[PDB]
Design a protein around this nucleic acid. Structure first.
Ligand SMILES: [Mg+2]
Ligand SMILES: [Mg+2]
Ligand SMILES: [Mg+2]
Lengths: 131, 292, 145, 251, 242
RNA sequence: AAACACAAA
RNA sequence: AAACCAUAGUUAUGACGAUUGCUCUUUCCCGUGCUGGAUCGAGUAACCCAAUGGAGCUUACUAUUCUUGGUCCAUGGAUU
RNA sequence: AGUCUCCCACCAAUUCGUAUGCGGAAAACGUAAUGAGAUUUAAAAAAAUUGUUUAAAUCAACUCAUUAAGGAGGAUGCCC
């Protein structure tokens, strides 16, 4: 009756106050990954650490995270809980989930990286339809 | 619409004087809650029971919404309400609610003992029932008592903003929230964030995710934050502003002049509403025909 | 209303980890070599603390917070190594996985934990324990020949 | 009683399985009660004539409402037949061509002038509306308004569950228990308006024009207007739910 | 009844001869398995794809269940089966299955490269496919090859024993088991116990709860663990005999 | 917990 | 010293998977229509829970937190 | 669910020997026709149950007061 969802996207964005410390430091992709690995291990044990997640279109205080449909609850309970402390910033970090989607239909800017990811995702879509 | 009813004020006793840094931090957190998005914010003030209430009326409210929040609202665009939580554990003879209830808008309670809980559920005229999620629960909460209370009025309040304080408090907070939701039958639940700084605030999605991980469905969270928050604001507002639900001091013409919405127009030093003459006897009764 | 309880029966089994000694292959011989005895340094608060540590170490913070609400050891004696762990019907899987992931006691090593019976009342647990104890005696009597 | 209690316990341990069950839950009563289970004439005249006057006035009001209901319909039908729009021509045409149906029709120009003034003066004296407005007290004013009489009052339906009842102004002719009775005027509309109170919001404005042009903004709630006191005080009130007021915030 | 088909043999190559202590430890492990409650036991033997296969028929299996475990089979009352896994890295020094499929019962494979996954999904007459749960999985498990290998009959094997060894590889094991559960879509998932010491043996309830908390539904666990394992054993027996 | 009482509240 | 007895029977009434049907919304066709048919989606409610059995009465439920039938000298719009 | 009522031995009778609007073993039990009533009343306001807890323009709802079963004759109204 229902189609099996592969995973689910999550719109992540950093919220760091203290404009001076904010413009002083500059986060990157590895920073994001380390923050996630620290949050999962702080809020959960190996259960949270074994959560599958990849990085797509990382920007300045913006990133998109795809999480399995079975672990959306574990991800959304851990993201809104943890607050970074002495990782790379003098001012602790707090993240707020802007929006969520389960159909890939979201467009912020007219860039083409979403188009390329969409192209590879439908070339996998027809491939899982046939296979 | 989103309502947060447990914004704490940096003062517990009347002997304390609030410095400018705390007021600046409160202004910053109000701006933070407004920028991302919110509709109603009611700041909280906490005092204990065995203390000596000052025999004043014009000094019971160290909030002065017209003084500094009057500086902030014209640029912010939201409204603020003053509320008080009563830390009542032993039924002592100190009881002067006839002044603080009429001076403030919302009156809540913080019971620690069983007798205090029983008297606040039966006789004490309050609006919300808040428990000490930091400490241990007083007893094994009953079902019939909470159901009769939420049918009679007062509902329970859950504050997810306290779980962001330390690590050892999260287990007790979850254990208390589970028991409250199990004993309250998920009817009279109002959610709030007790954050003292803008850095411990979250979005509505984080809130609904946390509560759905706690055990309450997300649709019920949305309904309790949309309708039940508005209703618990309305009750505590017109129980003090108006009489016992018989005569209202505010007249809603359109969709913005509401007793809880209209806050700068309605006078507070008195209860009158001086408006120009807009109702005559020669105008046509049918609004579809009445033209000016 | 009713609080939904679910008791858990577990057994402490000691595998005869000794590669230098030859062993007898039979039913009652291995039953006796696996049910030898529990050491003296065995109690209720020493097993509860160990399982509480393992729960936090495997699940995490919230996993221990949701599970430690009604986590108690009702009946346990070190003579037969049989214990009854009370928990919710929601967190039964968590307690079972923690009992499976039990590594060792802080001073006693080389032991495994086997969950046998899970039920929502103590009377059926006692009946099943009596049935298991009666079954154990049969192979013993048969092998004593 | 101690050795007696020991004997009772050694006796209960044979019948019951937990001997200290009843003594703990207090089921062993120490006492067994043995008892079989155990100038009026004119006053009556005035009461009867009052009963009769009430019973007659009820039917009179009902039939008056029905007569107005039929007369409005028939006169509007005849007006649409004759193609006459404004009231100043229609009422004169009815008077010059239909004498009977004219003594059954009401007159708003007859109903407004003294009623409005006699209610405004009464409310001004009740709420102590003075040239200066620094001698007010909101609590006592609201208590008086809850105790005040609204017989012949001007109220406007500003909010209601039905999107069509709002905006109707009228003066009271009688205060019922479920419906509210007023009279409205339009192009040809002279309808007696009956409005439900369960879920509607009313309001009344008191004009004050001594030096400046200002008015007080008061309002009532019909849903909770049914369980109030009448002309007296001291009626124990009950918190109902304060829950079905969602329409007030919704729109 | 339960089926355990991942008991490792203490021998990697052909050159190294087994010792009495290893056989004693294996006997201890099998006795512990039977004590906890099991019905079918299928010991596994690991070998490399580059190691030279002997040109024999009566020497391919350095197990000899009849002379070693045949007495335990009669006394304690269980059965043993032969299983061999193929640690394949590069398509070189191979192209021989008609002689290794008749001697042993169950044939498995262990791909560690992206070409190994293709070679396993395309041109291997295997029944189960296992990964290195201890270390990192080779590149990425996708639905493309997994669906095509499960629709024909090849299942994915999960080693719950590898987690009980150390503390650090637990994270990698969990990250791999959740990945393979998400990719396999929870149809062809068989479970095995890869423990060589009796101190890493568990029961059905604990393993079921672990696999359920890892992402597998309750019906899938029991249905697979029983029926798919029994069917794999039957298919292996049919491949050996006819 | 449920279920019971010329209780008790 | 037992009378021990329930097409649930004494703190139990579990765990997920699959199918039809029910209410609205964005679509195409024959004949207007038809508990006419098929895709894109959302939801399956609440009060609440047995402890020996039956009947009567009263009291809690169904607002995007499933539904159904009728009535209304209730109002709102249109024709005669 | 509820601090409501009743059956779960009999009695040509100090044992509700009760042919009492109908049904019913009983029931603080269901319903039918007419008249009246509102702290000025038979009784609701300044045993149980229920957040609001009958009505008080008309309708609808509650309470109380009368109507014993069957057969025959006459009168009236309807199809005829
Ligand atoms: Mg019951
Ligand atoms: Mg009860
Ligand atoms: Mg009962």
């Amino acid at each position: 009756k229902k189609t099996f969802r592969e995973w689910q996207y999550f719109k992540l964005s950093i919220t760091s106050f203290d404009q001076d410390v904010d413009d002083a430091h500059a986060i990157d992709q590895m920073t994001w990954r380390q923050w996630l690995n620290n949050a999962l291990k702080r809020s959960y044990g190996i259960f949270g650490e074994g959560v599958e997640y990849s990085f797509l279109h990382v920007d300045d205080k913006l990133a998109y995270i795809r999480v399995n449909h079975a672990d959306k609850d574990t991800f959304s309970s851990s993201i809104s809980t943890y607050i970074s402390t002495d990782e790379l910033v003098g001012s602790p970090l707090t993240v707020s989930i802007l929006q969520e989607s389960s159909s890939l239909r979201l467009l912020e800017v007219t860039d083409d990286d979403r188009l390329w990811l969409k192209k590879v995702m439908e070339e996998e879509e027809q491939d899982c339809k046939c296979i | 619409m989103l309502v947060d009813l447990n914004v704490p004020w940096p003062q517990n006793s009347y002997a304390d004087k609030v410095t400018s840094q705390a007021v600046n931090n409160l202004i910053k957190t109000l701006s933070t809650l407004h920028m991302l998005g919110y509709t109603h914010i009611a700041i909280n003030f906490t005092v204990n029971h065995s203390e000596k209430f000052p025999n004043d009326v014009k000094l019971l409210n160290p909030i002065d919404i017209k003084r500094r929040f009057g500086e902030l609202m014209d640029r912010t665009g939201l409204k603020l309400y003053s509320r008080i939580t009563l830390i009542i554990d032993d039924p002592s003879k100190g009881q002067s609610l006839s002044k603080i209830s009429q001076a403030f808008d919302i009156v809540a309670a913080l019971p620690i003992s069983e007798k205090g809980l029983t008297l606040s559920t039966t006789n004490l005229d309050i609006d919300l029932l808040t428990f000490q999620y930091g400490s241990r629960l007083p007893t094994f909460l009953k079902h019939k008592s909470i159901c009769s209370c939420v049918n009679r009025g007062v509902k329970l309040e859950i504050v997810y903003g306290y779980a962001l304080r330390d690590v050892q408090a999260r287990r007790q907070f979850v254990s208390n929230v589970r028991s409250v939701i199990r004993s309250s039958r998920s009817r009279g639940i109002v959610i709030g964030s007790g954050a003292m700084s803008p850095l411990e605030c979250r979005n509505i999605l984080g809130v609904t995710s946390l509560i759905k991980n706690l055990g309450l469905p997300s649709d019920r969270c949305s309904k309790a934050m949309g309708d039940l928050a508005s209703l618990v604001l309305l009750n505590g507002r017109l129980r003090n502003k108006s009489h016992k639900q018989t005569i209202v001091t505010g007249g809603g013409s359109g969709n913005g002049d509401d007793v809880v919405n209209d806050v700068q127009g309605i006078d507070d030093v008195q209860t009158i509403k001086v408006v120009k003459r807009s109702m005559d006897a020669e105008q046509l009764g049918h609004a579809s025909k009445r033209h000016k | 209303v009713r609080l939904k309880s679910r008791y858990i029966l577990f057994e402490i089994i000691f595998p005869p980890t000794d590669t230098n000694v030859e062993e007898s292959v039979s039913k009652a011989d291995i039953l006796l070599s696996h049910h030898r005895a529990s050491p003296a340094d065995v109690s209720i608060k020493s097993i509860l603390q160990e399982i509480r540590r393992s729960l936090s170490l495997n699940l995490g913070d919230y996993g221990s917070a949701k599970c430690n609400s009604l986590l108690q050891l009702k009946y346990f004696s070190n003579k037969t190594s049989t214990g009854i762990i009370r928990c919710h019907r929601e967190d039964c899987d968590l307690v079972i996985m923690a009992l499976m992931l039990m590594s060792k006691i802080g001073d006693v090593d080389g032991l495994i934990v086997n969950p046998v019976k899970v039920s929502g009342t103590i009377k059926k647990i006692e009946q099943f324990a009596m049935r298991r104890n009666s079954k154990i005696l049969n192979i013993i009597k048969c092998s004593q020949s | 009683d101690r050795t007696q209690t020991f004997i009772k316990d050694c006796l209960f341990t044979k019948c019951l399985e937990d001997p200290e069950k009843p003594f703990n839950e207090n089921r062993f009563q120490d006492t067994l009660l043995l008892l079989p289970t155990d100038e009026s004439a004119d006053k009556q005249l005035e009461k009867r004539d009052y009963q009769r006057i009430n019973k007659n006035s009820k039917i009179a009001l009902r039939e008056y409402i029905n007569n107005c209901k039929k007369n409005t319909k028939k006169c509007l039908k005849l007006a649409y037949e004759n193609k006459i729009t404004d009231k100043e021509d229609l009422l004169h045409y009815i008077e010059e061509k239909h004498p009977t149906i004219y003594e059954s029709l009401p007159q708003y120009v007859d109903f407004v002038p003294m009623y409005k003034e006699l209610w405004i003066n009464y409310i001004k004296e009740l709420l102590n509306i003075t040239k200066n407005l620094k001698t007010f007290n909101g609590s006592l004013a609201l208590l008086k308004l809850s105790m005040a009489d609204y017989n012949g009052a001007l109220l406007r339906v500003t909010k209601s569950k039905n999107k069509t009842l709002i905006g109707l102004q009228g003066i009271v002719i009688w205060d019922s228990q479920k419906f509210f009775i007023m009279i409205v005027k339009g192009n040809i509309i002279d309808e007696i308006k009956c409005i439900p109170k369960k879920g509607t919001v009313f309001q009344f404005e008191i004009p004050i024009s001594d030096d400046d042009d200002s008015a007080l903004r008061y309002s009532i709630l019909g849903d909770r207007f049914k369980y109030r006191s009448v002309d007296r005080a001291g009626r124990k009130f009950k918190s109902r739910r304060c829950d079905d007021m969602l329409y007030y915030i919704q729109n």
